[PDB]
């Protein structure tokens, strides 16, 4: 099945998922000189005070921090969005080395990692219905650079030993995603897709300009995870990023001057 290797990685995905070659694929390179400031864009509203994390999962690609999305508890609104988008999960993409790992790039710069906070449009009732709609999802993307530790990440890092291999999960309650956000909510936005199969073209991307800092030790713990299941040949979970895809007929807009 799909993955990140030589035989199953991104260049192969189109054979099982032909939208991989579609008109609105993600990620993309953000050319900061050509992204236009759009004064009609609103501030983003991130309301995570009542978020209820439940569980962390190793799905064999990344790890997912899952939320209770059965009410309006953790919502994204504003920005480029019409209506209300509910947080369902977050996950990361990262590299084997600090010089790669992000999916989006900024003037071709790759960050060490990228965090995706995934939210679905409440007007479609559930996540599975939302992904079938062009405005079904809003994903908040946040770059990670290596420097000072991010204290709000350490609880995640802590737990990874318990979910080393594919198919392992653990209780992960009371985790506050606010501790993963940068100071500024300035962003770029464009229409795109999920960055893993099924690659559905259902996402309004909101990519924050300001990266977070994490420590080398934090990232090194991500790189000890495994893509394999228990008791299978070890293959370190690294380089689980899709490269930039063609922008095609899209505009990237900036919330800031």
Say how many domains are in the chain. 1
The answer to whether the annotation marks 189 as part of a ligand binding site is: no
Q: Which two tokens stand for residue 216?
A: 């080398």
Residues with active-site annotation: 61
Check the annotation: does 116 bind a ligand: yes
**14 annotated as belonging to a binding site for a ligand:** no
- Phi and psi angles of residue 210, each rounded to the nearest 5 degrees, phi first: -90, 120
Q: Is 195 annotated as a binding residue?
A: yes
**CATH, residue 213:** 3.10.200.10
Say if residues 116 and 185 touch (Cβ distance below 8 Å): no
Expressed as residue numbers, the domain containing 249 is 1-257
For the chain, give the secondary structure using H, E and C: CCCCCCCCCHHHHHHHCHHHHCCCCCCCEECCCCCEECCCCCCEEEECCCCCEEEEEECCCCEEEEECCCCCCCEEEECCCCCCEEEEEEEEEECCCCCCCCCCEECCECCCEEEEEEEEEHHHCCHHHHCCCCCCEEEEEEEEEECCCCHHHHHHHHHHHHHCCCCCEEECCCCCHHHHCCCCCCEEEEEECCCCCCCCCCEEEEEECCCEEECHHHHHHHCCCECCCCCCCCCECCCCCCCCCCCCCCCCEECCC
């Amino acid at each position: 099945h799909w993955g990140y290797g030589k035989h199953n990685g991104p260049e192969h995905w189109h054979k099982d998922f032909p939208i991989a070659k579609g008109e609105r694929q993600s990620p993309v390179d953000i050319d900061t000189h050509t992204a236009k400031y759009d004064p009609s864009l609103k501030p983003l509203s991130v309301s995570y005070d009542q978020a209820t994390s439940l569980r962390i999962l190793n799905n064999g690609h990344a790890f997912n921090v899952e939320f209770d999305d059965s009410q309006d508890k953790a919502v994204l609104k504003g920005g480029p969005l019409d209506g209300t988008y509910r947080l369902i999960q977050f996950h990361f993409h990262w590299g084997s080395l600090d010089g790669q790992g992000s999916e989006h790039t900024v003037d071709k710069k790759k960050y060490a990692a990228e965090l995706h906070l995934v939210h679905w449009n409440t007007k479609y009732g559930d996540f599975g219905k939302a992904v079938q709609q062009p405005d079904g999802l809003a994903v908040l993307g946040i770059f990670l650079k290596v420097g000072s530790a991010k204290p709000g990440l350490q609880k995640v890092v802590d737990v990874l030993d318990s979910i080393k291999t594919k198919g392992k999960s653990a209780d992960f309650t009371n985790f506050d995603p606010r501790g993963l956000l940068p100071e500024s909510l300035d962003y770029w936005t464009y229409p795109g897709s999920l960055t893993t199969p099924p690659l559905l073209e259902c996402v309004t991307w909101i990519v924050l300009k300001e990266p977070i800092s994490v420590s080398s030790e934090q990232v090194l713990k991500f790189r000890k995870l495994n893509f394999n299941g228990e008791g299978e040949p070890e293959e370190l979970m690294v380089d689980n990023w899709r490269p930039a895809q063609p922008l095609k007929n899209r505009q990237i807009k900036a919330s800031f001057k």
